[PDB]
């Protein structure tokens, strides 16, 4: 949930394959923004009674509470779309099943996870763990001609001009942040953190619970930062500065690994296959975490209760439709379904202000709340400024 996310891969890799090491700042500043924003939700959940979804509901009337629910629920679907595309592409590379058919299979991948269920819930992740590590080892190995400072000269050391000027870099920049700061994790983390061991009503030493939770929230977020940098490096190394200007999608990475000279042919074919299985593996883990988050949002805003398997079906059904419509319109174009993938993360950018602002208001009222709301207010205004600028410059 940060490195096994196809939304993270496609944005970072095309962010390097098209614009070099420029967007490395955006990775850093968003990963840092994620650390801080997640810590606020952690506090919000442990301090106040319950999570962000119901907290937002307590301040809004039902009409505007549904509008907030709509925006939030769409962000959950947008993430699911990312998995649908990711799994469809994976099935196309491995089994040769066309994207239009693969997307249809994703409705019943839910059913496939129960086939994995009775084979060890620990047994399989160990294979996936080695799978991810092996694939990541390939990616690390696939980094040559690496200038030890040309990274730095744009990594963190911000070239803040093109990042906001032309739509191209700005578009990917929004996708990168939206994929690293996922709006549905704010609602999820603000409730799952209340499962830790501490006295609910009276004891304030639950700051210890916040202590552990924030440290854990910064650990995995650091790894996500490393991977995103590792993946942007990968795309830049392989596809950036080319005469043909490859966008650098999953298909490009597949044939880059499969046709890498030093990597051989038969050996290179294994690497590409392992990547495809890892891409498939990136899906089924994401849908479980996304389903629990959907429960919180719906029960928080609408105060409506339906079983997870049902909402897992409804959310998936709604996610496959725009994927299929996209495949029908552009006649199954693989580069076009990857644009929908990137766009799904750019939408997460649009939905963020509707989640960050309520998080802000709660964090400035009831005890144990933060000293400088300064670092958090400049984030929202600069955020809505950009998503509207892009939202207007395109339109």
């Amino acid at each position: 949930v940060g490195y096994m996310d196809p939304g993270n891969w496609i944005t970072s890799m095309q962010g390097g394959a098209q614009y070099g090491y420029t967007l490395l700042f955006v990775i850093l500043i968003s990963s840092l923004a994620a650390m801080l924003l997640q810590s606020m939700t952690v506090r919000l959940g442990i301090a106040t009674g319950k999570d962000l979804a119901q907290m937002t509901r307590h301040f809004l009337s039902k009409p505007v509470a549904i509008i907030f629910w709509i925006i939030a629920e769409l962000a959950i679907i947008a993430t699911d779309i990312a998995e649908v595309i990711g799994s469809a592409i994976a099935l196309d590379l491995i089994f040769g099943i066309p994207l239009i058919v693969g997307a249809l299979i994703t409705v019943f991948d839910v059913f496939l996870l129960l086939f994995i269920m009775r084979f060890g819930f620990r047994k399989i992740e160990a294979i996936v763990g080695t799978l991810i590590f092996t694939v990541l080892a390939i990616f690390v190995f696939e980094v040559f001609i690496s200038s030890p400072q040309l990274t730095d000269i744009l990594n963190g050391f911000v070239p803040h001009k093109e990042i906001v000027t032309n739509q191209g870099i700005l578009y990917i920049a929004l996708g990168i942040i939206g994929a690293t700061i996922m709006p549905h994790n704010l609602y999820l983390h603000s409730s799952i953190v209340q499962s830790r061991k501490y006295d609910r009503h009276d004891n304030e030493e639950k700051a210890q619970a916040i202590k552990y939770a924030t440290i854990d929230s910064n650990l995995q977020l650091s790894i996500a930062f490393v991977v995103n940098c590792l993946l942007l490096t990968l795309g830049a190394a392989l596809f950036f500065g080319t005469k043909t200007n490859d966008l650098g999608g999953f298909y490009d990475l597949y044939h880059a690994l499969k046709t890498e000279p030093v990597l051989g042919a038969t050996l290179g074919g294994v690497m590409s296959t392992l990547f495809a299985v890892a891409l498939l593996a990136s899906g089924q883990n994401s849908t479980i975490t996304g389903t629990l988050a959907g429960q919180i949002v719906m029960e928080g805003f609408l105060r409506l209760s339906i079983p997870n398997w049902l909402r897992r079906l409804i959310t998936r059904s709604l996610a496959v439709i725009p994927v299929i419509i996209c495949l029908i319109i552009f006649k199954g174009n693989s580069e076009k379904i990857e644009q929908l993938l990137v766009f799904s993360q750019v939408f997460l950018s649009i939905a963020l202000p509707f989640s960050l602002i309520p998080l802000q208001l709660a964090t400035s009222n009831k005890k144990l709340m933060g000293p400088f709301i300064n670092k958090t207010w400049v984030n929202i205004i600069s955020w809505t400024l950009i998503v509207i600028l892009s939202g207007l410059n395109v339109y």
Epitope: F239, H255, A256, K258, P261, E335
Partner: nanobody, 120 residues
């Protein structure tokens, strides 16, 4: 690296066929592809053309019936031939711009044609 063709053969008018254009070894990308044909006693004719961005165009004699497409996963260019007429009979060739690796310059490749016979 050689361009290999398949999927042809014998079929009745009204039937359909699907030609396959792949390379002998692993390729990074087929940037451009052309499907030529040559009926008995006639000239070599361009039938289908697919571009890098995916757009395609067909001869007026074959448009609406033929469909060229790229399988990015397997780097294969297909020619879906539907509602075949007896005059579609001939030898079909595959011209394609193969890119061996990512940064390798795009070379032009041809291939030994395959026989397509629409009978009766």
């Amino acid at each position: 690296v050689q361009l290999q063709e398949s999927g042809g053969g014998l079929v009745q008018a009204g039937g359909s066929l699907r030609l396959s254009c792949a390379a002998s070894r692993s390729i990074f990308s087929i940037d451009t592809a052309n499907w030529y044909r040559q009926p008995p006693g006639m000239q070599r004719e361009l039938v289908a053309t697919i571009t890098r961005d995916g757009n395609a165009n067909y001869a007026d004699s074959v448009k609406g019936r033929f469909t060229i497409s790229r399988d990015r996963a397997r780097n294969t260019v297909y020619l879906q031939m539907n509602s075949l007429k007896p005059e579609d009979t001939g030898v079909y060739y595959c011209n394609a711009a193969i890119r061996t690796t990512v940064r390798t310059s795009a070379q032009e490749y041809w291939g030994q044609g395959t026989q397509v016979t629409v009978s009766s």
